[PDB]
Structure 1
Amino acid sequence: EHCERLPYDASKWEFPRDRLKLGKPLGRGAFGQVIEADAFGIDATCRTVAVKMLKEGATHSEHRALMSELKILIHIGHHLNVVNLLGACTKPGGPLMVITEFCKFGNLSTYLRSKRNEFVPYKVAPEDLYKDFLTLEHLICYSFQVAKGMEFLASRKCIHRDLAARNILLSEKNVVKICDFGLARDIYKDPDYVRKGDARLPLKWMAPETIFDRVYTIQSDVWSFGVLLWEIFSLGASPYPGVKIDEEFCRRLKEGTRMRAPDYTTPEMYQTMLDCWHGEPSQRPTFSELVEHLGNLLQANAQQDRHH
């Protein structure tokens, strides 16, 4: 009933299906799927891409939902720190297909968890002992990038609504990208999504006003960003460790209960998390302010690493 019906620029976005060779499925959702593919001449060069399309026997409403996803991607536009649309297959002859840039390291949560034994706060010479290690610089840099992607999203007058580390993808050269799997995520088989009424909701990432009043704003996205920071500086742990996500949890959150400092945080990063978790939405920092602050922390962190 909405976004799928926005105008489409075929001369800009249309990619020939014949120039696309589909390979292995990457991820399987409730309605749609993401498939690894080789594409030729998308940017006379071959490139690995991610192709979102619908599963066999998709309904009309599922078709509408994928088209709505495509139009939202187009509206948002290009930024380094957002998963970028490379093209689309919308013409008669074959299925609706959305082609985005391939991020080879996958989601940030799983990736960070794989590096628990490959993290040092700062490398020490000889640095080859810490080859491919994560450092404080990496984590602050990831945080900084997501804040810039979220500032960009805000400037498009968009609200994410599902900001989390599972929705951050890691590309080449330590470049992180904000995304949403949407139709290609199975939220009914995902423990991050909790049943509250008719819907499955990411309760551990949701601001109190969102939980109680159903209010989604850019300011509740900032709350979510604070939970993401906690995920980054726990190296991909799950929020509110061991805590039952019930009525008591929601009550205590409204009353001012917050998560403790995660294992790999700096004092400055933890205060930033707490700032993002202000009970008053108006009192949370903006994403512009988060970009500024995290830029300052990235800079301060560099002064702690001066060997070279």
Structure 2
Amino acid sequence: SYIDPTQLPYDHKWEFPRNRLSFGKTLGAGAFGKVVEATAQGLIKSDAAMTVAVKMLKPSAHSTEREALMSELKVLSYLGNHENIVNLLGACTHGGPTLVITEYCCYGDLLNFLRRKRDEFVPYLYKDFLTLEHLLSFSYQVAKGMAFLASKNCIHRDLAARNILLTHGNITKICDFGLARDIKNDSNYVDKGNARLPVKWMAPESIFNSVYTFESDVWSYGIFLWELFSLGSSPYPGMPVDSKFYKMIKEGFRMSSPEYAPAEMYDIMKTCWDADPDKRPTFKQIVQDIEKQISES
């Protein structure tokens, strides 16, 4: 980590009264936390109600998870607004357990969206079919959001389609479900030491040395691109995470192109998976490379 979230300040301008929230359905839940849909009255100054997403801890949570939710709130507050990041709207740190209030993204996580849209995908009307133009736009927006996070000295550590949200106008927003994900029952997380980690998305230096950098997030972005252009398929299909998997990645085995990736997008993935972190493109370089591909299209 480059930044210390605990030394980050918390602006009380974010403070929102919890009695002005009406909780609805659970959007996501893990062992210690959950994301819940809510209606916030008096969030908009004109007295119009609005839908928000609220992250909070369950009574099952410990001191570690309580500190983690406060650190998460300081980090979100520090970042500020960006179009490709889930935006903080408010919080409640007084009169009860910590509540983190963000904007609500109506289409939910990108992975589930892609899987639902898989069968009606068109490479090139009212029906709202998913096209190659959308996948290229999602690639671009995620690289833009990640370029912004890197400029703010943020290392995500869990960049994957499951941590990307989709909202109005095909706008993608990077988020981090964290504790509001059931990692114990998610097959995308594997037991590694006394941790349950997303190994198929992790750079070799993160797997073998527990090192997380700007460059290890680029590797995960390469994996994200593979999920995107395979329309939500799990990476390294038919390959379980075992000693052979670790050996193969260390030796240079890399996934072949997903079925719908343009050759120029597969070229980005190959560079994101370079064994040498210094040879990987930066998110800024990726943004410029995709912008160019979008124009030429």
* Length-normalised TM-score, structure 1: 0.91
* Aligned residue type for 1:37: A
User: Do structure 1's residue 136 and structure 2's residue 132 form an aligned pair?
Assistant: yes
**In 2: Cα distance, 1:113 partner to 1:266 partner:** 19
1:107 pairs with 92, 109, 113, which one?
Answer: 109
* Aligned residue type for 1:149: G
Range with bigger deviation, 48-57 or 132-141 = 48-57
SS in structure 2 opposite 1:157? coil
Range with bigger deviation, 157-166 or 53-62 = 53-62
Equivalence for 1:175: 171
Shift of 1:281: 0.5
**In 1: Cα distance, 2:63 partner to 2:176 partner:** 21
**In 1: Cα distance, 2:80 partner to 2:184 partner:** 30
2:100 pairs with 82, 98, 105, which one?
Answer: 98
* Aligned residue type for 1:15: F
Asked whether the 8 Å contact 2:32–2:60 carries over to 1, the reply is no
1:62 pairs with 39, 62, 65, which one?
Answer: 65
User: Do structure 1's residue 40 and structure 2's residue 41 form an aligned pair?
Assistant: yes
User: Do structure 1's residue 279 and structure 2's residue 282 form an aligned pair?
Assistant: no
Structure 1 unaligned regions, length at least 5: 302-308
**Structure 1 residues 1-308: aligned runs within 5 Å:** 3-4=5-6, 6-10=8-12, 12-43=13-44, 44=46, 45-92=48-95, 94-122=96-124, 127-128=125-126, 131-301=127-297
**In 1: Cα distance, 2:66 partner to 2:260 partner:** 43
Shift of 1:55: 1.1
**In 2: Cα distance, 1:98 partner to 1:104 partner:** 18
Range with bigger deviation, 59-68 or 177-186 = 59-68
Shift of 1:4: 4.6
**In 2: Cα distance, 1:206 partner to 1:9 partner:** 34
SS in structure 2 opposite 1:238? coil
What is the count of residue pairs matched by the alignment? 292
**In 1: Cα distance, 2:166 partner to 2:216 partner:** 24
Range with bigger deviation, 224-233 or 27-36 = 27-36
Structure 2 unaligned regions, length at least 5: none
SS in structure 1 opposite 2:101? strand
* Aligned residue type for 1:78: N
Shift of 1:267: 1.1
Residue deviations 1:86-114 (CA, integer Å, cap 9, x gap)? 0001122x321110111111111111011
Asked whether the 8 Å contact 1:4–1:69 carries over to 2, the reply is no
**In 2: Cα distance, 1:209 partner to 1:7 partner:** 31
* Length-normalised TM-score, structure 2: 0.95
Shift of 1:42: 2.1
Asked whether the 8 Å contact 1:103–1:172 carries over to 2, the reply is yes
Shift of 1:5: 6.0
**In 1: Cα distance, 2:196 partner to 2:120 partner:** 34
**In 2: Cα distance, 1:197 partner to 1:238 partner:** 23
**In 2: Cα distance, 1:5 partner to 1:291 partner:** 31
Asked whether the 8 Å contact 2:23–2:36 carries over to 1, the reply is yes
SS in structure 2 opposite 1:166? helix
Equivalence for 1:305: none
**In 2: Cα distance, 1:60 partner to 1:244 partner:** 34
Identity of aligned residues (%): 60
The runs of at least 4 aligned residues of structure 1 exceeding 4 Å deviation read none
SS in structure 2 opposite 1:117? helix
Asked whether the 8 Å contact 1:118–1:132 carries over to 2, the reply is no
